[PDB]
Amino acid sequence: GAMGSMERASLIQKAKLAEQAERYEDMAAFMKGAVEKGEELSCEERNLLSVAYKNVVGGQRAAWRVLSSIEQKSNEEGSEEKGPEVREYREKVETELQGVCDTVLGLLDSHLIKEAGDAESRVFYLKMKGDYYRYLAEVATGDDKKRIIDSARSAYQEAMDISKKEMPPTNPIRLGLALNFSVFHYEIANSPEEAISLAKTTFDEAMADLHTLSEDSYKDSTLIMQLLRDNLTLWT
């Protein structure tokens, strides 16, 4: 590891600087180095890891979608053949995206999930595992796709089971997990009714628990509830 010679605290400090500078590839490399020190991550450090890789893979996903759309138009009837370049470059970006997802999944497997005993950490990491298998599923097309989809579903389901037993229905990790599992159902698993049902039940159970929250917690929970509502508006 190229970060093996840097102090854990220095890696965390530099991840925060990289976030401020919008240098998300650097941020992800610093947080990978911090994970590889072998100690568990605090709440703040888990957030830094998630922010870093979310931004890296988010740029890759946006680029892959642009290139996939160009490629699909090139394969429509009446399109003049442009050679292999669109496919090759889409494949290049796709392979890079898959590499980032595999890197994240490898960190979760070695050994973040197995050492995560508290609900807040274990649910966070299992949600991440579902998310990065979902990003793999977005580009999967072989006999690969069904197994990747099942891996995403399995991680999300384990996270859901823990979150329902151990967290209040307004907990932002629980809410973001349910949001992302509903997106999995709608966009990946061809299960829009399950997506709508999960988003509705999640929203309603959180609404009924808002009265227990402080002003700051209320703001955190309602932000994610609004995304559930925004999706329900798009889906219904």
Binding site: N47, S50, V51, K54, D131, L175, G176, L177, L179, N180, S182, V183, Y186, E187, I224, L227, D230, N231, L234, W235
Partner: peptide, 7 residues
């Protein structure tokens, strides 16, 4: 496309 959880 659907909205997923932010940072």
């Amino acid at each position: 496309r659907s909205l997923s959880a932010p940072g």
